[PDB]
């Protein structure tokens, strides 16, 4: 029937991307952060599954989405809770300790950084470029949550970003919050994360917003595993956006925006307003038949060209396999 993963519906294509990928990275002599030239502006959007037999609509899902963390985050009212906005879906991602990059790489490209290009770009940027500012905010935030051995623990982190094997669980080193903050600064693109320590909003602070992509990358996190929370190519009318807040027992705790400087945390709403794309959204709340306005960031509408577009493929191949399934599922 239908392939186990979005990209395996056209591997000659996957390759095309996995090759276009590194050619896009600009490595400034200026000593500025290694960043992507253009491919960061790309956003994948999943196809409309609500068009098929419930029996068939179902076989696609076992195939593509990670129903485990999907059910979890949704259960914890932390994933698909706002009714006024489009639903998001968790794509399955290799849990080889590079999940962070895999999930990011999927969200943008259809593919999945099996070539280690992102993971590399992280490490290379973290070794050959000025750690100065990262090290700082890393300290700064490690203090805010301590209720003495500095440069020592940070040397450890740069080490973990390495492509090489861990001297302990599985095949690559597990990444941590700071790497995300760096990753997003390599992408020049925000990354908001939906979880149950890392969940929050990461912004390309080492860049004037006047020059990075203002649509997020959305990831889901559970049991130390990273996933792309991609938007359904729904018909409407639900706005395409992520709430910048959560629902915590009747109040709206907004998201933890990370690695902010002490002056910055005092003007976040203004930062978020400009690195993101913020809109005020009406939300049934307070249960008391009342309403409540929350902030949400506009999400991107799929813009992967034909030439590199694995979904378009997997879909065709789904429609074919459905004509044959419809003709004679008996």
Closest among 72, 33, 297 to 191, alpha carbons compared: 297
User: ω into residue 81 within 30 of 0, thus cis?
Assistant: no
Residue found under tokens 């639900």: 238
Cα–Cα separations (whole angstroms), residue 273 to 41, 53, 143, 194, 296? 19, 42, 26, 19, 10
Which technique was the structure solved with, according to the deposited record? X-ray
Residue found under tokens 């949400």: 296
Rg (CA), the chain: 20
Closest among 31, 5, 27 to 310, alpha carbons compared: 5
* Chain centroid offset of residue 143 CA: 26
DSSP 99: H
The C-alpha atoms of residue 117 and residue 124 are separated, in whole angstroms, by 10
Are the C-beta atoms of residues 126 and 161 closer than 8 Å to each other? yes
Q: Structure tokens of 71?
A: 């059910």
The C-alpha atoms of residue 82 and residue 283 are separated, in whole angstroms, by 7
Are the C-beta atoms of residues 112 and 93 closer than 8 Å to each other? yes
Q: State how beta strands 225-231 and 200-202 pair.
A: unpaired
Run of H or E including 140: helix 132-144
- Of the residues 24, 53, 96, 164, only one is catalytic, namely 96
The SS3 of residue 75 is: helix
The C-alpha atoms of residue 91 and residue 306 are separated, in whole angstroms, by 21
- Of the residues 82, 99, 184, 212, only one is catalytic, namely 99
Q: Structure tokens of 179?
A: 């790497």
Residue 96: domain span = 1-330
Q: Is 99 assigned a catalytic role? A: yes
Q: How many domains does the chain divide into?
A: 1
Closest among 249, 250, 243 to 286, alpha carbons compared: 250
Within a 10 A sphere around the Cβ of 30, how many other Cβ atoms? 6
Closest among 201, 302, 300, 309 to 246, alpha carbons compared: 201
Q: State how beta strands 241-243 and 278-285 pair.
A: unpaired
Cα–Cα separations (whole angstroms), residue 144 to 138, 260, 265, 313? 10, 11, 12, 47
What percent helix, strand, coil does the chain show, rounded to 5? 40, 20, 45
145: buried, middle or exposed (CB in 10 Å: 19+, 13-18, 0-12)? exposed
- Of the residues 179, 206, 225, 258, only one is catalytic, namely 225
The C-alpha atoms of residue 296 and residue 299 are separated, in whole angstroms, by 9
Q: Structure tokens of 62?
A: 């076992």
Are the C-beta atoms of residues 89 and 238 closer than 8 Å to each other? no
Strands (E), 199-299: 200-202, 217-222, 225-231, 241-243, 278-285, 290-298
User: ω into residue 237 within 30 of 0, thus cis?
Assistant: yes
Q: Is 292 assigned a catalytic role? A: no
Q: Is 96 assigned a catalytic role? A: yes
Residues 6 or more apart whose CB falls under 8 angstroms from that of 19 comprise none
Q: What is the resolution of this structure in A?
A: 3.2
Are the C-beta atoms of residues 136 and 154 closer than 8 Å to each other? no
Show the DSSP H helices in 24-91 as ranges.
Answer: 54-64, 67-75
The C-alpha atoms of residue 7 and residue 287 are separated, in whole angstroms, by 43
The C-alpha atoms of residue 166 and residue 12 are separated, in whole angstroms, by 32
Residues 6 or more apart whose CB falls under 8 angstroms from that of 144 comprise none
């Amino acid at each position: 029937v239908l392939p186990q993963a979005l990209y395996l519906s056209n591997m000659r294509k996957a390759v095309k991307i996995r090759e276009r990928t590194p050619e896009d990275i600009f490595k400034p002599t200026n000593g500025i952060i290694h960043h992507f030239k253009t491919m960061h502006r790309y956003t994948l959007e999943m196809f409309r599954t609500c068009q098929f037999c419930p029996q068939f609509r179902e076989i696609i899902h076992k195939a593509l989405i990670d129903r485990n963390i999907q059910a979890t985050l949704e259960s914890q009212k932390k994933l698909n809770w706002c009714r006024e906005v489009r639903k998001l879906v968790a794509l399955k991602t290799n849990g080889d300790g590079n999940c962070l990059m895999h999930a990011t790489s999927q969200y943008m490209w259809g593919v999945q950084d099996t070539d280690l290009v992102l993971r590399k770009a992280l490490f290379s940027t973290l070794k050959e470029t000025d750690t100065r500012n990262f090290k700082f905010r890393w300290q700064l935030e490690s203090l805010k949550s301590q209720e003495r051995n500095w440069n020592d623990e940070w040397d450890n982190l740069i080490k973990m970003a390495s492509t090489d094997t861990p001297m302990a669980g599985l095949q690559y080193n597990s990444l941590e919050e700071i790497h995300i903050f760096v990753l997003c600064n390599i992408l020049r693109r925000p990354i908001i994360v939906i979880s149950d320590k890392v969940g929050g909003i990461y912004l390309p602070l080492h860049w004037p917003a006047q020059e990075c992509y203002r649509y997020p990358i959305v990831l889901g996190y559970d049991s130390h595993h990273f996933v792309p929370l991609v938007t359904l190519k729904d018909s409407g009318p639900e706005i395409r956006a992520v709430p910048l807040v959560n629902r915590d027992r009747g109040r709206f705790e907004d998201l933890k925006v990370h690695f902010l400087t002490d002056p910055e945390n005092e003007m976040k709403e203004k930062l978020l307003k400009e690195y993101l794309m913020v809109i005020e959204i009406p939300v049934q709340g307070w249960d008391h038949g009342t309403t409540h306005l929350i902030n949400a960031a506009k999400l991107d509408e799929a813009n992967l060209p034909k030439e590199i577009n694995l979904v378009d493929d997997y879909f065709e191949l789904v429609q074919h396999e459905y004509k044959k399934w419809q003709e004679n599922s008996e």
